[PDB]
Amino acid sequence: TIGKHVKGYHYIIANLGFTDGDLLKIQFGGAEVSGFQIVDYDDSLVSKFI
Amino acid sequence: NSIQIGGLFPRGADQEYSAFRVGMVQFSTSEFRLTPHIDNLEVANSFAVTNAFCSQFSRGVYAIFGFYDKKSVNTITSFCGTLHVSFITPSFPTDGTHPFVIQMRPDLKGALLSLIEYYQWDKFAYLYDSDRGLSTLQAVLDSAAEKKWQVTAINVGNINNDKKDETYRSLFQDLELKKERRVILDCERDKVNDIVDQVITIGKHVKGYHYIIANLGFTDGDLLKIQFGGAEVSGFQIVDYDDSLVSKFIERWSTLEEKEYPGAHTATIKYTSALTYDAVQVMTEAFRNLRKQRIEISRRGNAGDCLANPAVPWGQGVEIERALKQVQVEGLSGNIKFDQNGKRINYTINIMELKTNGPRKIGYWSEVDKMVLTEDDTSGLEQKTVVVTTILESPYVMM
Amino acid sequence: NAFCSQFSRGVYAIFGFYDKKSVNTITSFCGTLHVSFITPSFPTDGTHPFVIQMRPDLKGALLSLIEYYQWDKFAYLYDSDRGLSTLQAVLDSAAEKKWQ
């Protein structure tokens, strides 16, 4: 809303639910966004569970 | 005593219909009361427009209120010119001077050019839609040719909803091939809102970007979300809320029951509905003037076939058009006057700028007052030139 | 009026012309009444049904001819009485190909 998601800003999400939140709306802003996740969707076990 | 009028309302114009009904209630008089022949069709369909026009002609309405689309403006103009039935419409004015067509919407091309010159713009992008035609695009291209501008016109309405997000992203990324920072949004309010959503999603609403909303509905949109971004946003509005009449109407407008008057339980009214209300006021004043001039409209409602060969003009249609063009009243859209072509004259358009606290007026424009700013924050210190004294001494001060 | 008279006659197919001020009416009438319209006029901007357009789309040839001469700066003298589809095409190509 205040336009601080533009390129030049860096954000770190300090939780293990980085992609489980609604981070889509800042994907195209240009600011670098990072975080952590404990759920690895690339695992066969996680794929079967999904 | 009742007077027949025809209504061509596009489907979904709930607020326009509500304002039409409010105007009918306000301006009705006991000596003559209006009766509408409301036809709700797809206004873009030329066949539907012809069918509605013929249905209203068979009922013998002396005047027709409604709207037209880019694919139906020619039909309305030709039918009105042939059958001598005056058309009252808040739609975009015709590029050519077509008789029996009355325009409530003022010309904003001159105001747009004045605003562009005010910001001393020379290089800017132009995102346009065909909804109101390409007359504004033609005018801005001619002004670019005369004033040596670098207008980069991009069509914004040809995209589809299935690829809305990706098309606009590439559109704004193609702008960075020119590093464009100045953009004018020449489209209706929903398209402007979609463009603002795409901008705020991609973060081009930050300070350094400048936007001009090329319509008379600047605050009728959702510009609140772009208010805090930092990019300068400007536009035009024909509805001025500082007027006592507009304030009283808004007080009456907001208190109405929503189920009875859909789209009316709002603190703000779109310029389309306001001009719909003012059009009812104008044509009621036209009939009042015609009756005061002791002219009669007793032509029977059994007009007959619309497509008779040859066509049948009626003399009283010219009298009704003359009365309509003779109307000079004060409405929600300010002063209302018409020229020989039915286009509005002596109108005053307000120019708004979007600040942190909200939109505010900065100036006004007219055909005799080109971009006259309100001179807020009156001078007297640091603008009344400070008296600088000095001594003739080289190399400091010398003739 | 002419289209209505011919439709009342019951013609199986219709041949005719149009301009920017009557193309929409013809297209709408043909789409509604389900009558083919054979026309040598300029192609319609949209994909309107029931209108048969023999005139080839010259926008592609014009753009390829501009690209053949390696043009990047030119004037465009156009008549408004034949549709602005070509003008919009040349403007969007200029935006895409960095022309002036």
Curated annotation (Swiss-Prot), chain B:
**In what tissue types does this protein appear?**
Detected in forebrain. Detected in dendrites of neuronal cells. Expressed in the pyramidal cell layers of CA1 and CA3 and in the granule cell layer of the dentate gyrus.
> Glycosylated at which positions?
232, 346, 376, 383
Q: Where in the cell is it found?
A: Cell membrane; Postsynaptic cell membrane; Postsynaptic density membrane
The further comment given in this record reads:
The postsynaptic actions of L-glutamate are mediated by a variety of receptors that are named according to their selective agonists. This receptor binds AMPA (quisqualate) > L-glutamate > kainate.
Quaternary structure per UniProt?
Homotetramer or heterotetramer of pore-forming glutamate receptor subunits. Tetramers may be formed by the dimerization of dimers. May interact with MPP4. Forms a ternary complex with GRIP1 and CSPG4. Interacts with ATAD1 in an ATP-dependent manner. ATAD1-catalyzed ATP hydrolysis disrupts binding to ATAD1 and to GRIP1 and leads to AMPAR complex disassembly. Interacts with GRIP2. Interacts with GRIP1. Interacts with NSF via its C-terminus. Interacts with CACNG2, PICK1 and GRIP2. Interacts with GRIA1 and SYNDIG1. Part of a complex containing GRIA2, NSF and NAPA and/or NAPB.
The text of the family note is: Belongs to the glutamate-gated ion channel (TC 1.A.10.1) family. GRIA2 subfamily.
Q: What does the entry's free-text domain comment contain?
A: The M4 transmembrane segment mediates tetramerization and is required for cell surface expression.
This protein is called Glutamate receptor 2
Of the intact sequence, the residues represented are: 25 to 429 of 883
